[PDB]
Design a protein around this ligand. Sequence first.
Ligand SMILES: CO[P@@](=O)(Nc1nn(-c2ccc(-c3cc4nc(C)cc(N)n4n3)cc2)cc1C(=O)O)c1ccc(C)cc1C
Length: 555
Amino acid sequence: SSMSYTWTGALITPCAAEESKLPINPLSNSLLRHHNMVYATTSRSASLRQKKVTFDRLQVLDDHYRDVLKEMKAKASTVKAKLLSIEEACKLTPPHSAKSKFGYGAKDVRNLSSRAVNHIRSVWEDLLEDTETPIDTTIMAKSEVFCVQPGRKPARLIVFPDLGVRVCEKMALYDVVSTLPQAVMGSSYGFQYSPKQRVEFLVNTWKSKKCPMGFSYDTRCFDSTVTESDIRVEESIYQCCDLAPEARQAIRSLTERLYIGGPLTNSKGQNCGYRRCRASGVLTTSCGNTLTCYLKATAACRAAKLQDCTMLVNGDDLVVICESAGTQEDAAALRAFTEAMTRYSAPPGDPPQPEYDLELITSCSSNVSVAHDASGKRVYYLTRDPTTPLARAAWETARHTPINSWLGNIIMYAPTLWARMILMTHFFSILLAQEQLEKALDCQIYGACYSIEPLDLPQIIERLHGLSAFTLHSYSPGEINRVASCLRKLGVPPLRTWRHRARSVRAKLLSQGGRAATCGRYLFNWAVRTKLKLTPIPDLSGWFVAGYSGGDIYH
Ligand SMILES: CO[P@@](=O)(Nc1nn(-c2ccc(-c3cc4nc(C)cc(N)n4n3)cc2)cc1C(=O)O)c1ccc(C)cc1C
């Protein structure tokens, strides 16, 4: 056997009191009235999750797999990757990253304190001198907010090494994980695209097929499906880069000591068990998942004899668009695809279904939809079911949180009916009332943390989505119906209320002048009776280059 996890009986413990409900009394009640619908996961459901993620992996590799792997390595062998200096790696550490057990924290790392850098150097030397000893990790239950569904999701489990080790991962591997995936997978590497670019790729791919069929593939507990073999195959791809000798060794040692597995320690310092699958909180998780998903999926496409496939991969998230052969034979091919993924260790959660309308394909929890701009031209844009974004926004209104998913959701889904009507109106109202428009806030974009001034949103949205994001109307019936239904479920006030609120915050923003007034003019033009003509506004290099989920990255 090869078990994803072995358990001792020690509990997955919280490090502090955990909240699972919105506070009693108002705050987010003006956002949504059905507060009992909103919950946050805690350590109290850790054991339900442990049951789902724990199983034996039988893996059977074939010629298709080996062929694809060799192709990927040929492309990987064009890459030259550089060691990051200590200073560069320290600057990529988020200011609230989990402190080291060696008596320094994220702020000390970022300041290059004596104790921090002493430890980081000792850890680096230790990777070079010790090639075997498993590296300790901490296991914790993740706190995430959802809406109930007619019951409740258990907490996800996060597994991560000590801050000192995380700084060493950046030095050995940041350049690799930021450059290799695109070198290997080209246009298939989803993290290279902004939302507009993603939409474009999907639409152009779909229109390029004589008769398109598409499907999303959901692997059940992907991280747990990843084998020790997969993780060594992943290293085999990394080792094709030109690398400094210390980087080669650090990659070698990290692979055997950390990435393939190791001991799990709870917040109380007790041994909880042992992992032999992917850790969610290491630098290589997004890259590793993306490579492994792509490899397995490309080989399965061949085994299924699916014709003219174009794939788009974002970590464990997969969508394929191919040439239809007919209904019955697409169904059969998709079953063979699944059978081969299952042999490769990646069985499905939701059984995949062939889809003949691009708009009904959900990938990265998002779908393509269509609206029209001021002049009436069709504009394709990315949207999703707003339930989770709105539940999270109510939580962040009522309780202090370091990550502001509302701000990330505005950036990624600015064109949508729901982000504009609700999230912009609600959060600009609070910010303006609290006199904090100017204050920068943390949010996440493809797993990395960015500090963003709310007043820069008009500029950010134009660059990313186009001027069109401020003028979209004539949304599709499908999208409208989903929005309305979600908003009934959560008890969100009607359009009239948001329109009034938006007119009011728009008035106050305009009177302040400057970036505030720009926010009023562009973000809230939908709210006014007599629309204004909107025009172009007088460094996003690192944005939408790569994914870093769990990889402890800041900018
Ligand atoms: C300016 O012209 P619009 O009025 N045009 C439209 N409005 N809608 C629209 C607006 C709100 C809701 C809705 C349903 C619901 N149900 C509950 C329970 C609660 C709440 N709040 N809602 N809201 C449903 C449809 C669609 C269109 C269109 O052009 O296709 C408009 C309003 C806002 C925004 C951000 C953008 C536009 C273009």
